[PDB]
Amino acid sequence: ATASWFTALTQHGKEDLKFPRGQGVPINTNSSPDDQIGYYRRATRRIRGGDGKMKDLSPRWYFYYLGTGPEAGLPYGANKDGIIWVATEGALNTPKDHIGTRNPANNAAIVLQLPQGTTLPKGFYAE
Amino acid sequence: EVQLQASGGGLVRPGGSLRLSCAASGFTFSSYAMMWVRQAPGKGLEWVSAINGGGGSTSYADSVKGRFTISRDNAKNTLYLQMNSLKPEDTAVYYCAKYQAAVHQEKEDYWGQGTQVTVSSAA
């Protein structure tokens, strides 16, 4: 019963998700400049193909504010496979418990939007 | 059902102070981050502030930071907004709500009527 506030970015190519410094935080007008900091966490589903063999699907990367989500305890910038960090200029390095996470029973994800001019790696698309 | 009723609005002069309250019912209040939002005449809804269940983690719109404080009393199922150094631009209907992310939040019916704040030298 915890989830990202936003939809995921699907990785369609070999390049992992990353952003230039200052980019990558989803738009959320219910938040302040100090709040604009967090991580994306990769999740990879496995399902059986038509031929019967289990296979990995395209990875999906989900944004969580700093101090929330599966890596709520990780400090900003900590190195961990499948975790990348993003922060807008002016963000404060503190846990965002006042934003927290989404309960899927109560609210649907909002579409992850990034400001015009955000660089994305090959194989990624964003609204 | 989940209900959050705002109160405490009034008419005050610029520079004045007002404390808004929000009574929660129908859900476990302490389990939720909360927010205040406001809507001024002929303007879009503006997010004001947010607070975690534990009461120590907060943030604010740049337009109110340093003049307003959000707080909560979980034992009383109540959320507060203490407003100081009020400006005419703070005139609006104020609403409380469970925190949610949004891109250009619009008014929700489940917020109720909200509470009117008016800041004017005529007061």
Numbering used by the authors:
A (entry chain A): 48 to 174
B (entry chain C): 1 to 123
From the paper:
The structures reveal that the two sdAbs recognize distinct surfaces on the N protein RBD, away from the RNA binding surface. sdAb-C2 recognizes a concave surface on the N protein RBD, burying 765 Å2 of surface on each partner. The bulk of the interface is hydrophobic, with sdAb-C2 residues A33, W47, A50, Y99, A101, and V103 docking against the NRBD surface. The sdAb-C2 epitope overlaps two residues on NRBD, D144 and H145, which are mutated in 575 (0.12%) and 2010 (0.41%) SARS-CoV-2 genome samples, respectively. Despite neither sdAb’s epitope overlapping the RNA binding site directly, both sdAbs slightly reduced the affinity for ssRNA (to 0.70 +/- 0.04 and 0.63 +/- 0.04 μM, respectively, for sdAb-B6 and sdAb-C2). We observed robust assembly of N+RNA condensates that was significantly compromised by addition of equimolar amounts of either sdAb-B6 or sdAb-C2.
The N protein plays several roles in the SARS-CoV-2 life cycle, including facilitating viral RNA production, suppressing host cells’ innate immune responses, and packaging viral genomic RNA into developing virions. To accomplish these tasks, the N protein possesses a modular structure with an N-terminal RNA-binding domain (RBD) and a C-terminal dimerization domain (CTD), plus three intrinsically disordered regions (IDRs) at the N- and C-termini and between the RBD and CTD.
